[PDB]
Amino acid sequence: KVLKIQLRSASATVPTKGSATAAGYDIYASQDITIPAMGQGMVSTDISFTVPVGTYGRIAPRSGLAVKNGIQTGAGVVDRDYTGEVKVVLFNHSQRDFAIKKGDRVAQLILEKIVDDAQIVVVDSLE
Amino acid sequence: DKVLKIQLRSASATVPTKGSATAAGYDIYASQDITIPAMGQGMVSTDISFTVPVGTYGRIAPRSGLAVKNGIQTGAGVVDRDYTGEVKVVLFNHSQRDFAIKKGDRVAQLILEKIVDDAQIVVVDSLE
Amino acid sequence: KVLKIQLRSASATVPTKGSATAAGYDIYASQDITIPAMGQGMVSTDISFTVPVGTYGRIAPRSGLAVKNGIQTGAGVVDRDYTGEVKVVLFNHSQRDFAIKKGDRVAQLILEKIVDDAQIVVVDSL
Numbered sequence: 033k034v035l036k037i038q039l040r041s042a043s044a045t046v047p048t049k050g051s052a053t054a055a056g057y058d059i060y061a062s063q064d065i066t067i068p069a070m071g072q073g074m075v076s077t078d079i080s081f082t083v084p085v086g087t088y089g090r091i092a093p094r095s096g097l098a099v100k101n102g103i104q105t106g107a108g109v110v111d112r113d114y115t116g117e118v119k120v121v122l123f124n125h126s127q128r129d130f131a132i133k134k135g136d137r138v139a140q141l142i143l144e145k146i147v148d149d150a151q152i153v154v155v156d157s158l159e
Numbered sequence: 160d161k162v163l164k165i166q167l168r169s170a171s172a173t174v175p176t177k178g179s180a181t182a183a184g185y186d187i188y189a190s191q192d193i194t195i196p197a198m199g200q201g202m203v204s205t206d207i208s209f210t211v212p213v214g215t216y217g218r219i220a221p222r223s224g225l226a227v228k229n230g231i232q233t234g235a236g237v238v239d240r241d242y243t244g245e246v247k248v249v250l251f252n253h254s255q256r257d258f259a260i261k262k263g264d265r266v267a268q269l270i271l272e273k274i275v276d277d278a279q280i281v282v283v284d285s286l287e
Numbered sequence: 288k289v290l291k292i293q294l295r296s297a298s299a300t301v302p303t304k305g306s307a308t309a310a311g312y313d314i315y316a317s318q319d320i321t322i323p324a325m326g327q328g329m330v331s332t333d334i335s336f337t338v339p340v341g342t343y344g345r346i347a348p349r350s351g352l353a354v355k356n357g358i359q360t361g362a363g364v365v366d367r368d369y370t371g372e373v374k375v376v377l378f379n380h381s382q383r384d385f386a387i388k389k390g391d392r393v394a395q396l397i398l399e400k401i402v403d404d405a406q407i408v409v410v411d412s413l
């Protein structure tokens with residue numbers, strides 16, 4: 033059940049649960065960026081991680097940013113074996129640019145359990 | 160563990176319904192009329208609170224008909240097991256038509272997603 | 288755990304992982320379609336599937352199409368008992384039309400584990 037986190041620069045922040053019982057770990061921007069109104073952006077984190085066996089890491093939205101700033105996460109599927117820098121894709125569905133500073137929390141990581149070793153069987157009909 | 164506890168906060172709430180014993184999610188119903196403006200967003204009241212099973216969180220996920228026919232996308236959507244407030248549905252309207260919601264309309268579904276909720280974070284110099 | 292796939296036409300492609308340890312099975316368009324700028328569309332796949340017991344099929348976005356083309360999946364909850372054709376609903380949040388050709392990978396299927404046998408208990412307080 034280990035979540036291994038690698039901080040790639042001094043600007044990274046270890047992901048943190050917002051509360052003791054939160055489903056997700058908040059993910060912090062490591063560099064300023066603005067997500068334009070009715071536009072999108074890719075936020076740097078300067079982190080890598082290896083999620084637990086049996087999961088993938090889902091980059092999910094924070095509800096406050098959704099309501100107040102019209103922000104939704106895009107993409108969001110991080111494989112357990114990914115060792116590159118994790119990036120957060122954000123869409124801004126509002127009419128106001130959304131300014132992000134280093135150290136702002138921009139999403140939350142959820143360790144989603146999945147079946148990642150299914151046997152695929154082709155059949156004539158599911159019926 | 161295999162119990163979903165549901166608190167109704169108003170007479171106009173609806174207990175979420177699966178219907179088919181093998182559907183993924185429980186339908187979530189608006190408890191108050193609301194209009195989601197075109198190219199805009201809104202927060203739908205449900206007048207329910209719930210506690211999902213241990214080892215899950217509640218994901219507010221889209222109904223399929225609304226996405227195609229109305230340009231509606233479900234936003235936010237992560238409900239913690241220990242949340243006791245009113246559950247609200249965040250909807251974005253990416254179409255050019257306002258989307259009218261009436262009390263009793265199905266607006267989303269709740270999926271009890273299994274997660275690792277007790278991981279230990281280990282900070283390492285390299286994942287290699 | 289078995290993922291059963293029904294191919295409804297010769298234009299369908301059996302879903303494939305992008306690599307041996309990918310989380311998701313890439314889903315292929317079976318017919319050309321254009322997703323309009325700032326609008327949405329529905330991609331045919333000409334497949335049906337029955338996911339493993341204990342899961343549902345989530346139609347999740349690919350990161351490249353998100354960044355490059357402004358594409359987000361919509362809807363995307365495939366119940367284990369759904370036997371119809373699975374279509375991929377795409378939102379295009381960009382101001383550019385997105386053209387899809389038969390055989391393009393347009394989304395990824397994730398076999399998400401869930402509690403699908405909970406019992407509802409109505410209580411006066413949590």
Ligand SMILES: O=c1ccn([C@H]2C[C@H](O)[C@@H](COP(=O)(O)NP(=O)(O)OP(=O)(O)O)O2)c(=O)[nH]1
Pocket residue numbers: 050093094095096097219234235236237238239242245246247248249
């Ligand atoms: O779609 C949602 C999302 C969340 N909520 C509620 C339940 C959830 O547990 C709580 C917090 O969600 P987030 O962690 O996504 N919001 P945020 O990080 O902005 O605020 P918080 O400080 O509460 O964590 O808000 C909803 O009612 N509907």
Ligand SMILES: O=c1ccn([C@H]2C[C@H](O)[C@@H](COP(=O)(O)NP(=O)(O)OP(=O)(O)O)O2)c(=O)[nH]1
Pocket residue numbers: 091106107108109110111114117118119120121305348349350351352395
């Ligand atoms: O939001 C994301 C999504 C993915 N990623 C990284 C990790 C993930 O494992 C990797 C691949 O994700 P996808 O399969 O969604 N992208 P795509 O299918 O476009 O590229 P690939 O050929 O690498 O599979 O990109 C992020 O950093 N942020």
Ligand SMILES: O=c1ccn([C@H]2C[C@H](O)[C@@H](COP(=O)(O)NP(=O)(O)OP(=O)(O)O)O2)c(=O)[nH]1
Pocket residue numbers: 221222223224225268346361362363364365366367369372373374375376
């Ligand atoms: O992206 C999707 C979403 C759903 N579907 C299929 C599978 C799913 O199990 C079935 C029903 O989806 P919803 O609960 O999302 N749609 P809704 O509640 O509007 O209508 P229905 O009465 O058909 O369930 O539609 C797709 O093919 N693609």
Ligand SMILES: [Mg+2]
Pocket residue numbers: 050054094095
């Ligand atoms: Mg939070």
Ligand SMILES: [Mg+2]
Pocket residue numbers: 186222223268
């Ligand atoms: Mg439904």
Ligand SMILES: [Mg+2]
Pocket residue numbers: 305349350395
């Ligand atoms: Mg991929």
